[PDB]
């Protein structure tokens, strides 16, 4: 599937494509394939659910989605989802304050892009996410990103990857009201790592900008933090060439 979507402000021109839906505040994406969306969302969610052997790329060539009740982006089942940002374009992406689960024992989604499975950044173009409700990026798995002109403003986490956060290009730039970047996986085998190989991030956070459990690796990289608490918390390895980790 190779699909275009068109939002203005409260009509939606999209696409008939197998298993694309568009309900009043929904977009559901339900077969692989590329989705092209563009244009002014006033309260919407895309959300992606189609199954953990398929992938999909979503383009964001121009868009601003606000969500007045979950995440503008939920990636409920996927093997991986793309994000693409097209060159010379702003995105921006805004959630809800709090919340509101349909189930409401549910706490996920819990980011403002929020993906179950692996999802990966790239792109030559421009991400504003404003995160009220909670993290700003955050997936169950494996957080990539390759490119991109990246702004993250986040209530608690700026990057969550319980698997894993790389980094490996793009312009970053993190405002949290706990870490910067965080890594959970104490479960798994090769998780729990924070690489950066590449890119100019800066990072704000009350608390670490980089928190992992079990390793943080950078090198080749521009990374300048201002943190409440430590650059670098990780009781595993740290992997850190000199010239790399310095203050904002
Ligand atoms: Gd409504
Ligand atoms: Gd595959
Ligand atoms: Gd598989
Ligand atoms: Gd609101
Ligand atoms: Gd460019
Ligand atoms: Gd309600
Ligand atoms: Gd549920
Ligand atoms: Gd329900
Ligand atoms: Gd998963
Ligand atoms: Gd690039
Ligand atoms: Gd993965
Ligand atoms: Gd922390």
Request: charged share 25%; hydrophobic share 35%.
């Amino acid at each position: 599937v190779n699909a275009k979507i068109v939002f203005d402000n409260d009509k939606v021109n999209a696409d008939n494509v197998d298993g694309l839906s568009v309900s009043e505040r929904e977009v559901k994406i339900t077969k692989p394939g590329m989705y092209t969306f563009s244009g002014t969302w006033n309260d919407g969610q895309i959300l992606v659910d189609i199954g953990k052997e398929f992938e999909a790329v979503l383009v964001l060539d121009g868009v601003n989605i606000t969500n007045t009740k979950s995440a503008p982006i939920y990636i409920k089942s996927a093997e991986k989802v793309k994000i693409e940002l097209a060159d010379g374009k702003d995105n921006v992406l805004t959630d809800a304050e709090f919340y509101e689960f349909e189930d409401p024992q549910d706490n996920k989604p819990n980011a403002c892009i929020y993906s179950r499975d692996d999802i990966t950044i790239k792109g030559n173009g421009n991400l504003t996410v404003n995160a009220n409700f909670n993290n700003g990026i955050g997936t169950s798995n494996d957080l990539k990103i390759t490119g991109g002109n990246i702004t993250v403003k986040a209530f608690n986490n700026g990057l969550k990857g319980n698997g894993s956060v790389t980094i490996s290009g793009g312009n970053i730039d993190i405002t949290a009201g706990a870490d910067g970047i965080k890594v959970e996986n104490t479960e798994e085998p090769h998780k729990g790592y924070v690489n950066i190989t590449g890119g100019t991030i800066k990072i704000r956070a009350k608390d670490d900008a980089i928190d992992s459990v079990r390793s943080v690796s950078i090198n080749n990289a521009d990374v300048k933090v201002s943190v409440g608490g430590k650059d670098v918390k990780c009781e595993g390895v740290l992997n850190i060439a000199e010239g790399c980790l310095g203050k904002l």
